[PDB]
Design a protein around this nucleic acid. Structure first.
Ligand SMILES: [Mg+2]
Ligand SMILES: [Mg+2]
Ligand SMILES: [Mg+2]
Ligand SMILES: [Mg+2]
Ligand SMILES: [Mg+2]
Ligand SMILES: [Mg+2]
Ligand SMILES: [Mg+2]
Ligand SMILES: [Mg+2]
Ligand SMILES: [Mg+2]
Ligand SMILES: [Mg+2]
Ligand SMILES: [Mg+2]
Ligand SMILES: [Mg+2]
Ligand SMILES: [Mg+2]
Ligand SMILES: [Mg+2]
Ligand SMILES: [Mg+2]
Ligand SMILES: [Mg+2]
Ligand SMILES: [Mg+2]
Ligand SMILES: [Mg+2]
Ligand SMILES: [Mg+2]
Ligand SMILES: [Mg+2]
Ligand SMILES: [Mg+2]
Ligand SMILES: [Mg+2]
Ligand SMILES: [Mg+2]
Ligand SMILES: [Zn+2]
Lengths: 83, 101, 146, 90, 239, 66, 52, 81
RNA sequence: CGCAGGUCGCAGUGGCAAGGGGGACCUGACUGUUUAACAAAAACAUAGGUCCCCGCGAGCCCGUAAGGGUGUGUACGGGGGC
RNA sequence: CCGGUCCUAAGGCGGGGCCUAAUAGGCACCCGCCGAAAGGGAAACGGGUUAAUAUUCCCGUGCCGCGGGGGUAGGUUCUGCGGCAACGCAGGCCCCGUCCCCGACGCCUCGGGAUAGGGCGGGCGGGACUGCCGUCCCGCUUAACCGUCGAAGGCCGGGGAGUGCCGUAAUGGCGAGAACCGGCCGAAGGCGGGAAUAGCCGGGGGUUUCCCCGGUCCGCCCGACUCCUGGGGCCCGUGAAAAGG
């Protein structure tokens, strides 16, 4: 409760209520977005801000989806074609 | 020229990535019209950027603007109707960031 | 019971601003609930003094004088007011967006734009008027810039 | 334009015979125009807002949406009062 | 009490122990790696003396190895008897040409590698005795030793050389390096102590100790421990 | 609570409403369908508003003026 | 500092709590046995002949 | 399971205003057990049970009857009122 | 932020807030630590220098033993002195 | 729907085993578990109410997990549709497996975007003072949740540049593909709905806290130590893991 608010794990948000008061709300920071398994960069189409777990994130319409970016996928397919 | 009418190509980008198709038309330098028949391999007949396809070493004989059924008889003449049914399987574990820099 | 404790929460003010009329001394000992304090507030025997806000007439008068230039001499300064680092940011942005607009429209060639763009970074020009004077004087552009 | 993604979805949805999704996409298209335009007027960026409102007039003609016309009329009325008070003080 | 600091170290207290949870794992050869692999990562490991490479083998085993100088992410290495003696390759000591520079040498096969594991260090393959299946290599100290010819070593020299050339300019810099290592920092001289605490502690003009024999018991075995000689003359006698 | 801009879409929700609330202004009327899950609100022109109340009363949906 | 000021640090910590077996304030919450009856490190009741 | 009823000033105000009967039960009785006991013993319907353990070591349950039954009627029927 | 003019006091960073300065010798390089409750130092530590025991089944240390620490380490290293 | 409860950390305990004259003594091994009311981590906000509880009671408006019903898209040998692409879109049902990612991370520094808060002018309402002047003060609010928008940054297609050319606060960038054009992904937060019906201000009637009336506005400015984003630098110092997803 209280020392769990003295740590910076949550966001201290000030808001003015309809009753005229100003109160501090403690909200969660967002979870990290999915990253590619090769370069580690965020994946397009899946990088919107999400604040709780258990939320489905629809992957892009491609083979391997939200696992690798389009650069890794296309290049790997080129190698498989020649190999 | 490698990207020419009658050439089997593997689409590398988009939803149809990894699937097989055959060039049937040439729009310009930047574009060609591919159709590996949608019943056969899963690729609809439409233009594709030539950078989004990978040519294979296998090529067939069909005239420009060849119909979809023409490509089917051509590939069965070459006995490649089964080859057009497979899909290419990448090995992502062999890729490093140097390959895509 | 403590009436001021109850009355302050009804009125939504501090206990230091709650006023109980001395005429209602007899009725204080009978009050049991907050409904009894609500009856007395309606009757006007319990109210709240308006809160104090610091008057700003002297400040508002003084602020006009400061805008005219009064009360900012050497004997009124104790620390740093002007931001030296912040001034450089505005100096580059004013001069770069001026030069970039001129080249974008075509009045300054990219070659002559480069020497002025580097002269701006090199602290050659004191301000925009100096840059305009240099551009007009040396005829770096076909039409004079205002 | 700003809500062009919703225009393409409507024609794609109607082309595939998805009457339900075309209605849902029609609602999103009206939401994209009214919400973005209504935020601009509240910030009083009338130049940005009027460009969106002019685009909304075309879309309602192109898609037969009266609710865009009704809501655009409300937003133009607000723009008139904002510009009128600006002229008075200035 | 009266036990000296070197006796207290053996108890394994927290201030004498290695914080090995700060590392990803031991840098050792897995016993059953062969074929082709890819250098997938190059990492700094806290407390270690060289950069560490992660190898993704073809069959799928991933292990940690000290990175040879010049090794890069995305490189292909060869492991096994059929590998060539190129830099970064993991080969048996039997198949290494003489005069080659190697590191992470295994004394016996399967221990994971023992010698030439610090940054800038290497071992030189001096000779071969295939009859007894030993390889003569010169360790970084200059000692020449025989190792199992079936054992494995990596080609090249360990990356990260010259690290000790730069001074530890402040006491604070060596403080932070001590926290990723096991060293107790800092250290009090023996003669700055009292006689209950050190053999050297004590007198009104504190002095060090003359050397102790090799048979001295713990608590007395501090200072020079059965040393052959001391000073510059000992250095001359060695050469 | 959710807001809907097309009356055709809102009619699907408002017809199933336990109660339809009405809030009146000069240029528009707020129609709020109270369902079991959400409260659906639409802003319509005043002339459209008395029309929508009419059939909803014919659909037996309760219409309550707020 | 070892006297009265350091006595003020004994307001929030604890070494022992009440033992379930003997009910005394002698259960060491870190060592996880009772300093009186030995519960948690000895199933037999702790009692010594040198103690009356 | 039930030990007694709470007929204090707070409990009586709750009965008239929120349809709640306040009872003292065993300390180990759960909300599922308290709702079953109230329905079985008195033949009423319980909406929800709010429970607390008093500082003196007892368990107190605020049982809200469903909206067809009178909390004050059950108090006056039992004769504990 | 600047300039010009006028003007009051004993006094204008007017209260509040707010470095005295310089030369020289001894000494420890420096920042740091220290005798809770009479010692803060010129004492300890320190970076740097150097010597010794050690190729790992090592060297040094802990344990009655089983065994353990250094060690998820390997001489650009571990330990021990000055 | 606030915490514990769950997870693992540094660590610890128990059983087996080995050791021990012996245990209530030791633990490298195997197995299990414990270990955080400041770390990781499901989901609730505003108003009202009591003598004393208030995200817990009451009102209103929601959210999470688990399960069920209907409708719908879809499926019913077999595959969802669109776009060159980045990627977009309701994207069938059940069981099992594997892999990847999120969880998941320092310090310093400088650019950008917001919000809380604060101020100025006008308007309305109410209050302060009576030597003079007529000024001074207060109210004018908007929660969670639904939708839409989205700065930086990343990416896609066209284009094919060296006499260069495009830039930053700063370092800068380009045939290993720039300028330039078009598009995709994409924060805090905004705005609409919630919601004026609440709350507040002022003016009244009744009586035990209820009812009526009006107002709840216009144009600006500053701006965080709070929130978001990106750039640069430092390390013989590299800044947890697991549940869960
Ligand atoms: Mg927590
Ligand atoms: Mg966190
Ligand atoms: Mg002054
Ligand atoms: Mg500077
Ligand atoms: Mg340590
Ligand atoms: Mg001493
Ligand atoms: Mg001696
Ligand atoms: Mg002695
Ligand atoms: Mg001595
Ligand atoms: Mg303790
Ligand atoms: Mg409870
Ligand atoms: Mg003073
Ligand atoms: Mg000193
Ligand atoms: Mg000092
Ligand atoms: Mg002392
Ligand atoms: Mg002293
Ligand atoms: Mg000293
Ligand atoms: Mg020296
Ligand atoms: Mg000496
Ligand atoms: Mg636990
Ligand atoms: Mg209280
Ligand atoms: Mg004002
Ligand atoms: Mg700068
Ligand atoms: Zn006990």
């Amino acid at each position: 409760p209280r020392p769990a608010y003295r740590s910076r794990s949550l966001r201290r948000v000030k808001v003015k209520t309809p009753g005229g008061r100003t109160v501090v709300h403690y909200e969660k920071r967002a979870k990290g977005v999915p990253k590619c398994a090769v370069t580690g960069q965020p994946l397009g189409g899946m990088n919107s801000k999400v604040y709780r777990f258990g939320i489905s994130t629809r992957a892009p319409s491609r083979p391997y989806g939200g696992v690798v970016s389009h650069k890794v996928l296309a290049r790997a397919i080129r190698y498989a074609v020649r190999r | 020229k490698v990207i020419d009418v009658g050439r089997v190509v593997v689409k590398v980008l988009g939803r149809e990535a990894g699937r097989k198709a055959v060039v049937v038309d040439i729009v310009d330098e930047n574009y060609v019209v591919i159709t590996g028949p949608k019943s056969l391999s899963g690729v609809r007949r439409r233009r594709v950027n030539i950078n989004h396809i990978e040519p294979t070493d296998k090529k067939i004989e069909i005239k420009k603007g060849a119909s979809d059924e023409e490509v089917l008889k051509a590939l069965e003449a070459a006995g490649l109707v089964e080859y057009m049914k497979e899909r290419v399987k990448p090995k992502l574990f062999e890729i490093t960031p140097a390959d895509v820099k | 019971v403590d009436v001021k404790r109850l009355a302050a929460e009804i009125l939504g003010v501090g206990v230091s601003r709650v006023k109980i009329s001395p005429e209602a001394v007899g009725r204080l000992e009978e009050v049991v609930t907050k409904d009894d304090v609500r009856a007395l507030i309606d009757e006007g025997l319990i109210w709240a003094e308006p809160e104090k806000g610091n008057s700003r007439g002297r400040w508002r008068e003084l602020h006009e004088k400061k805008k005219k230039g009064r009360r900012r001499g050497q004997g009124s300064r104790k620390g740093r007011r002007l931001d030296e680092e912040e001034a450089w940011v505005n100096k580059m942005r004013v001069m770069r967006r001026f030069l970039n607009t001129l080249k974008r429209q075509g009045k300054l060639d990219p070659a002559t734009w480069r020497q002025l763009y580097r002269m701006v970074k090199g602290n050659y020009f004191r301000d925009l008027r100096h840059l305009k004077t240099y551009i007009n004087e040396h005829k770096l552009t076909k039409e004079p810039v205002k | 334009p700003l809500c062009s993604k919703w225009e393409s979805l409507i024609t794609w949805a109607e082309k595939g015979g998805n009457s339900y999704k075309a209605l849902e996409f029609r609602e999103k298209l009206v939401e994209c125009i009214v919400y973005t335009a209504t935020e601009k007027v509240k910030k009083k960026k009338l130049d940005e807002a009027e460009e969106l409102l002019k685009y909304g007039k075309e879309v309602a003609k192109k898609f037969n949406i009266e609710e865009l016309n009704f809501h655009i009329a409300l937003l133009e009325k607000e723009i008139s009062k904002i510009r009128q008070r600006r002229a008075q003080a200035q | 009490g009266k036990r000296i600091l070197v006796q207290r170290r053996g108890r394994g207290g927290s201030q004498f122990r290695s914080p090995s949870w700060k590392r990803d794992g031991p840098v050792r050869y897995p016993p059953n790696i062969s074929g082709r692999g890819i250098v997938v990562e190059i990492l700094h490991e806290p407390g270690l003396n060289a950069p560490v490479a992660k190898i993704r083998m073809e069959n799928g085993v991933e292990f940690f190895n000290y990175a040879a100088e010049g090794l890069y992410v995305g490189q292909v290495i060869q492991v096994g008897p059929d590998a060539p003696p190129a830099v970064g390759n993991v080969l048996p000591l039997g198949k290494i040409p003489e005069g080659t520079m190697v590191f992470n040498v295994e004394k016996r096969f399967g221990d994971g590698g023992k010698f030439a594991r610090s940054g800038g260090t290497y071992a030189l393959v001096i000779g071969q005795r295939p009859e007894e299946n030993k390889t003569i290599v010169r360790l970084p100290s200059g000692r020449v030793i025989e190792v199992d010819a079936r054992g494995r070593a990596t080609i090249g020299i360990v990356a990260g050389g010259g690290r000790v050339e730069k001074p530890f300019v402040k006491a604070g810099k060596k403080y932070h390096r001590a926290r990723a290592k096991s060293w107790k920092y800092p250290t009090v001289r023996g003669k700055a102590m009292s006689p209950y605490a050190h053999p050297h502690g004590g007198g009104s003009h504190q002095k060090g100790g003359t050397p102790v024999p090799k048979t001295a018991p713990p608590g007395q075995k501090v200072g020079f421990i059965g040393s052959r000689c001391t000073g510059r003359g000992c250095v001359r006698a060695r050469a | 609570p959710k807001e809907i801009f097309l009356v055709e879409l809102w009619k699907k929700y408002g017809e199933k409403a336990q109660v339809v609330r009405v809030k009146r202004y000069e240029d528009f009327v707020k129609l709020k369908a109270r369902l079991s899950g959400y409260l659906y609100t639409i802003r319509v022109p005043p002339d459209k508003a008395e029309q929508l109340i009419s059939e909803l009363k014919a659909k037996n949906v309760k219409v309550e003026e707020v | 500092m070892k006297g009265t000021p350091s006595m003020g640090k004994h307001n929030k910590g604890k070494t022992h709590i009440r033992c379930p077996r003997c009910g005394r304030h002698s259960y060491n919450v870190t060592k996880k046995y009772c300093a009186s009856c030995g519960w948690g490190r000895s199933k037999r009741w702790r009692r010594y002949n040198w103690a009356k | 399971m039930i030990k007694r009823f709470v007929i204090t000033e707070k409990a009586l105000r709750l009965a008239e205003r929120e349809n709640k009967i306040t009872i003292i039960v065993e300390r180990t009785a759960t909300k599922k057990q308290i709702a079953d006991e109230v329905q079985r013993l008195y033949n009423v319907k319980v909406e929800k049970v709010n429970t607390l353990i008093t500082p003196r070591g007892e368990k107190k349950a605020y049982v809200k009857l469903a909206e067809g039954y009178s909390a004050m009627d059950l108090l006056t029927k039992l004769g504990v009122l």
